[PDB]
Write a protein that binds this ligand. Structure first.
Ligand SMILES: *CC(=O)Nc1ccc(NC(=O)C*)cc1
Length: 134
């Protein structure tokens, strides 16, 4: 047999993700991480798998690790913020989305109104959660 490289495992996971096989993709990214745990994008990609599978604590842990390895990552701040938003950690989520936005502008990766839209939605969900209380 052949043992694929971590990079090959990441690409295989990407094809599994494109194939909408999210548990399988997550496991493949996990094999990539085992082969080389110092590459942030393996964790961010697996985090997105876990968000598609609504496995929040696993996504959260992966976003934290990705950001330890690449503190400049637009994607990992965005996914961290999305995971926090879904766990109703609103203020943390918003701050991570604002950092994703600022990093994206700096890197010229701010596409359309995407991250500002995520920020508006996060802020409105936070606002609704307070406004709806008795
Ligand atoms: C390749 C891939 O994952 N594409 C993709 C396209 C559209 C969406 N949008 C929604 O699910 C709303 C997700 C993934």
């Amino acid at each position: 047999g052949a043992s694929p490289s971590a990079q090959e495992l990441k690409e295989q996971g990407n094809r599994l993700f494109v194939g909408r096989k999210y548990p399988e993709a997550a496991a493949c990214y996990g094999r990539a991480i085992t082969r080389n745990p110092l590459v942030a994008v393996y964790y961010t990609n697996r985090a997105l798998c876990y968000l598609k599978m609504q496995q929040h604590e696993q996504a959260l842990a992966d976003c934290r690790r990705a950001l330890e390895l690449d503190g400049q990552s637009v994607k990992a701040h965005f996914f961290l913020g999305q995971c926090q938003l879904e766990m109703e950690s609103y203020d943390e989520a918003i701050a991570n989305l604002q950092r994703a936005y600022s990093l994206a502008k700096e890197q010229r990766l701010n596409f359309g109104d995407d991250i500002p839209s995520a920020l508006r939605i996060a802020k409105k969900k936070r606002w609704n959660s307070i406004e709806e209380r008795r």
